[PDB]
Amino acid sequence: EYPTVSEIPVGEVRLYQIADGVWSHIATQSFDGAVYPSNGLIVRDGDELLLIDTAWGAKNTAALLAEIEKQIGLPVTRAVSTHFHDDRVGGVDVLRAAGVATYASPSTRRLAEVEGNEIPTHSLEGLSSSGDAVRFGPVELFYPGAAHSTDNLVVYVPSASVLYGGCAIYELSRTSAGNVADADLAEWPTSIERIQQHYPEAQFVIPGHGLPGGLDLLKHTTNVVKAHTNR
Amino acid sequence: EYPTVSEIPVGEVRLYQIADGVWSHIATQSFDGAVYPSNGLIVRDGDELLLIDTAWGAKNTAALLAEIEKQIGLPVTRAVSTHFHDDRVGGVDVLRAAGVATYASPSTRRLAEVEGNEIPTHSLEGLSSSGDAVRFGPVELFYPGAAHSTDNLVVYVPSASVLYGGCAIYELSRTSAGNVADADLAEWPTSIERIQQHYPEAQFVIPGHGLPGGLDLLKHTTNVVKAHTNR
Ligand SMILES: O=C(CSc1n[nH]c(-c2ccccc2C(=O)O)n1)Nc1nc2ccccc2[nH]1
Ligand SMILES: O=C(CSc1n[nH]c(-c2ccccc2C(=O)O)n1)Nc1nc2ccccc2[nH]1
Ligand SMILES: [Cl-]
Ligand SMILES: [Cl-]
Ligand SMILES: [Cl-]
Ligand SMILES: [Cl-]
Ligand SMILES: [Mg+2]
Ligand SMILES: [Mg+2]
Ligand code: NA
Ligand code: NA
Ligand code: NA
Ligand code: NA
Ligand SMILES: [Zn+2]
Ligand SMILES: [Zn+2]
Ligand SMILES: [Zn+2]
Ligand SMILES: [Zn+2]
């Protein structure tokens, strides 16, 4: 039922309704001779939408906004990027040009600038220390500590018990580490345990790439990170 | 013009005619949350066909044979696997059940057995030393030395100037190393130079995965291997 790369040509975006007023958005990107999917989140906040992460690039993100406009028909007023990599901020300029207020932590904004990536305009304060949580409309933003990146955030939708782990959480089908160039392998398991301890009631867990599941995805990611550590 | 993973659902196989009586076969496989393509070769020999490498698995290889039967309509009498990994021998049992004589070097047969992979039935003698070449019907088989694997073979079709590099040769779009668990990074550039020196007249170069090109694919692979070596 969840869309895979098969049903998504490169450049198209699919939406998947997880619960009342909660969708994921799925896009694909081709690099290094393979094709990868990527997830973000959409959360209804009254008569508007909060977007979590771009669709991995300007063209994808323009298709994302067109797909939201036709399938949901509510305005995207704010967006949050969960870390500084292109699958999360690639397309921020498209969002800004459409009138979306783009947000990220100062850590993410700093790292995006150093990398030469697109930089969300607004700063999310209160997330600099591991275990920090802040409310952002219909979601909670949580900094679990360094993992996939030193800045990665996770997002929880309390009304639907949906946990969006971003790239700090792997799908079950991924049994080897992904891009860990910017990761903190030493701290990643501890950061996942902070997620587990803060959101033990989560019923739906969305990885940054691939199929959703339950809280088992946290233990799965810990297994994979530790195996990579011991390579 | 060359098929990519977009036009190939996982489980289907496409044929691409390179020249008179020379085709590549293209399949896809899901692996670790991504989709990868894979190439093999088909070379007409009189009224029969020589197959280079499986389509990466039993289902793909059954689809490969059905696609050959309907699009070319000539019998596959012999097959050669160019190294011992599953994208080259996965499906050998299907070929054997269909009456195809399967071949590999004793080095490949030895390594496949150790790995628990399918084992081609017939042995290709005369390929144990770097630089060894043997004729096999309408092609020449060449052992350039260890590279992607210690056993990898390349195949040249002299009548069409087609060089099938297998997984020792990367497509241009791949700028980072692939699966190098069984590779000899120290010897891979020297092995590529042997290919260059033996087939300087090659006009079309087929990598194990992705888009074909010219002999520049050899220098490209050297560039990528050396960069990975210096990681
Ligand atoms: O490299 C980046 C951001 S780094 C990153 N974060 N997450 C991942 C990632 C990707 C696939 C599967 C798993 C993961 C993961 O482990 O999360 N990669 N973007 C980028 N570079 C490009 C170069 C050329 C063309 C397009 C490009 N798009
Ligand atoms: O390990 C193998 C065969 S080794 C091999 N040879 N060539 C390649 C290859 C594949 C794609 C792109 C480039 C290359 C390359 O670099 O040539 N891979 N298959 C395998 N392992 C798995 C482990 C877990 C789940 C599924 C798995 N499927
Ligand atoms: Cl590839
Ligand atoms: Cl931590
Ligand atoms: Cl992936
Ligand atoms: Cl060598
Ligand atoms: Mg490739
Ligand atoms: Mg994945
Ligand atoms: Na490509
Ligand atoms: Na809102
Ligand atoms: Na023949
Ligand atoms: Na060139
Ligand atoms: Zn990332
Ligand atoms: Zn990612
Ligand atoms: Zn291989
Ligand atoms: Zn391969």
Automatic annotation (TrEMBL), chains A, B:
Zn(2+) 3 binds at residues 87, 167. Zn(2+) 4 binds at residues 87, 167, 209. Its EC number is 3.5.2.6. Zn(2+) 5 binds at residue 122. Zn(2+) 1 binds at residue 47. Mg(2+) 3 binds at residue 138. It holds the Pfam family Lactamase_B. The keyword Hydrolase applies. Its cofactor is Zn(2+). It comes from the Bacteria. Mg(2+) 2 binds at residue 12. Belongs to the metallo-beta-lactamase superfamily. Class-B beta-lactamase family. This is beta-lactamase.
